[model samples]
Each structure stands twice: as structure tokens, then as C-alpha cells.
Target chain A: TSSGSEGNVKLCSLEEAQRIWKQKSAEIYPIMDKSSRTRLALIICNEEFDSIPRRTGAEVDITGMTMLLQNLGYSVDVKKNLTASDMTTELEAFAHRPEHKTSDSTFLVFMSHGIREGICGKKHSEQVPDILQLNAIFNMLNTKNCPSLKDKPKVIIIQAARGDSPGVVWFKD
Target chain B: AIKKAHIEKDFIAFCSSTPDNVSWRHPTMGSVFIGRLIEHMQEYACSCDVEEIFRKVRFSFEQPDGRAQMPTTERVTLTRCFYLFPGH
Candidate 1:
């Protein structure tokens, strides 16, 4: 084991880090064959913004993602430019979809402008602007809620700008 | 409430950049991270596992570019290496 000091962190060598990673990854959870189960992916790309500058390359990201997931045998559902509430509702609905019971694996992709607190949603001139808190979505999919997905492999990919903090915030779950 | 919930086992999350970091994308080529990720997946998904492919992508970013971006991966409960193309 490694130790750290106050206001500082202990470091491990590259070799040691790789060894730990390998050891942890060796535990496998059995999954159904690709041919025997449904592979589904929800691709959400938010590019349009009312106050912020339009994201320039978001379209390319979406196109690339769609192709990649499709090639991997996932039936992709692409949703674009949603408000915070819409995004939350979509995720909730997706979690309850009957298809999860038959899927061996599922993937979710979110591309947007985000702060440390949450993702930015398109602003409606008349309504209160909203942001998508990261936890709002994650909570809906947890085991106690979305039981249909229990024991199945799930992958979530997110690409978003961060809040004006100093360093990276690493999320473990 | 959300914080108290447990993320189920067998889950993985890949983020393009660390918190407070900017994720870069060319005006036309798309995100450097995702672009290279797709390319590498196509090239190695047939033979290498997902973790190996991610390592290769990470190396690609380490090249002498002045811009700094580091992708992050979190395995909530993954027990084994996941293959994008298992049969190949």
C-alpha cells in the first residue's frame, strides 16, 4: 500500500499502476453473446445554446459516435438540443424502457457544455434556464431504481466542458 | 439521495476530459479525444481489448501538442476487460 502526506499525494510507478489495473480488471461478469441479445445506445448531443456561442464541431462528434456505436451492433437513438428538463425526462424514460430486460449491454453518450455542477441546457427566452446536474441522471439509473439493468454491463461516455475550477475532477462512479 | 445510491456493478464511464479541463475539437475534425478514439477502435477493436485501446489513445494524446487534455475512465463494477469486437 502507498501513503500520502498532508497537502500532498503519494505516487505509484507506471508499472505498479498497470499491475493494479490488470488485477482489478481480471474479475469478469458474464454477459450474453452479442448475437443473442439486443445492443442499445442512447446518443445525446447538445450543441445549440441561446446565450453561449454555438459549439463548432458537435455535429462531427455526433456523426462519429453514431457510426461507432452502430458498428458495434448497438441500435442507436440520437437526441439533440434538449433543455435540462427534457434531458432528464428522456433519461428517466429510457431507464424504464422494456427493452432493458432483453439487452446484454447498453451505452449512453452525452456531449455538451458543462460546468462542474451540471451541463448547460439551451435557454428559452421566456422560461427559467436550467442545467442538468450530473447526479440527477445517474441517480435514476442506479440499482434501486432501474432494476431492469441490474447485473448487465453498461457504458456511459460524456464529453463536456468544465466549470472554472483549477484542476480535473475525476469521477469514480 | 443520489450520492447515497450505489452505481450497479459491471458499469464503466469514459469522460473526454478531467473536471475543469477543456475538451478540444478541430473546427472540422471533431474532438481530438473522440476522433482518435474512433480511429483506434476501428484499428484495434478486432484484436485488442477496450483497456488496451484506451491506453493507445491516451498515448496518442501525449504527443508534443501544447494543448493539454486527458481522458478519464472509471469502472464502477467492471470485472473483466471489455472487447468492442469480441469475435475478431
Candidate 2:
């Protein structure tokens, strides 16, 4: 019996998210049922670039992220190859979706060739890189902007380059 | 409890790379980070919270020779744990 995978798995549920402070188990986020308002997820992946090489395998990220979100009971809004400005407006619009009012939580994803400034738009230029600033997006999703999702967990997943710099490495004996 | 009404509350981020580092990719597998991310979440989501899942994803980068890319999760202020409860 011990060899089996049967274990004391810590389980949390959507209902507990709305549970008030009289708590014994750890608190979890409140989530409405899908029969009413389904959870919404956004996936924006940019594979094509003007100056730099295209992100050849970005489609995989889009499809992969989409599958996971859908499996998690989300109706995902998928987009591709948009300008920097469109990315901003699309996300802003997503934050204002009426369904969020009744939904449990949300997810936002951005996959692209990015710089420290932000994710570069389709028309990446050396003279002026098309960009969607991360701060701008964060502002749109904050409590002030998307009151519908206030207190509900907002899970943001970003797959992009901050720059050409490499992650730290260490020397050991 | 309703929790604090801060301007930014209950937000968690799982970034493919640190603020100054560039993430890597494979020609066919797409963003390496997303691949690992999806794998871990799918496998462990039944028993782990979002934060815990991401931590496990971060651990995937550790290797004997060490790895180049490192996925990072930002400081989160989630008042409670979030579970996908996918099968439900």
C-alpha cells in the first residue's frame, strides 16, 4: 500500500477562495462556477519580427499554453503577430471583459522576443523598437483598472527575453 | 477575510528569465521555459499550489553542469492559494 501513489495530497478548491476568515485549511481564491461565468485566459504570441530573426518555434508556446489553459477550464483568447500597440489595446480590452465579474480568476501570457523595455512588437526596428511596456500592462490589470478581478488571483506568465545577457553561473571545486 | 485592498493584490508572475537575462529556445520545442512550465503544471497541479508548481519548474533548470536559463517567479501577494482543480 505504501508503494502506491496514494498520499496526503494538499488539496485546495475554488469554493474555498470565497470562504470567509473562519479558516482552518489554508485560504484559497474564490471561483465562480463555469455554468455561469467561465474563467478567461489570454495568450499573445509573436513569432515574426522585422529586424531580428523570427521566433521559429513560438507556435508551440501558443498551442502549449492554450492547451493547459483550456484543460484548466479556461476559455482562452488567442492572438498572434500583432503590433506593439495592438498588444496593449488587446490586453486592456481583455482586462475589461464582463465575464471577469463572475469568474474565479484569470491568466495572461506574453511570448515574444523581448528587451528590458518590454516585449517587442512585430515591427522590430533598430531605429525604434515597437514595444509594449510591462508596466503599462500591469497597470491595466491592477485593482484600479480591473475592479471585476479585484482580490481574485491574476496569474501572469511571460516567456520573453529580457536582453542578451545570460543567467548567472558559478564555479565550484 | 476579504484581505487588503491594495492597488495591486493577488497577482503572481512566472517569468521565463530574470529581469536582465534573455530566455533560450529550441528550434522545434519552442521556448524551453514554457515547455517545462506546461509539463510541471500538468503533472503536479493536482497536489501543488500555483506558487509551489512554479518553484518546481524553477528547479528543473538545475543540472550537474549547471544551466544557462533560470525561470523566476515574482514576489506574490496572493491572499490565498490558487488551484486549477483541472479535473473538476
Best-performing candidate as measured by DockQ: 2
Candidate 2, pairs of clashing residues: A17-A28, A17-A29, A17-A30, A21-B1
Task: Name the lDDT of candidate 1.
Answer: 0.70
Q: Root-mean-square deviation of each candidate, in angstroms?
A: 11.3, 5.5
TM-score, structure 2 vs. true:
0.86
Q: Per-residue lDDT of B30-83 in model 1, one digit per residue for the tens?
A: 777778777877676555556677778777776435556777775556656665
Best by lDDT: 2
In model 1, how large is the Cα lDDT of residue B68? 66
For all the predictions, what are the DockQ values?
A: 0.26, 0.50
Clashing pairs in 1: A27-B79, A169-B19
Q: Is the docking of candidate 1 incorrect, acceptable, medium or high quality?
A: acceptable
Which whole-number lDDT from 0 to 100 does residue A3 have in model 1?
25
Question: For residue A89, what is the lDDT in candidate 2?
Answer: 87
Per-model TM-score, in order, reads 0.77, 0.86
Compared with the true structure, what per-residue lDDT tens digits does model 2 show for residues B24-77? 888788888999988887777766679889999989887623347888887587
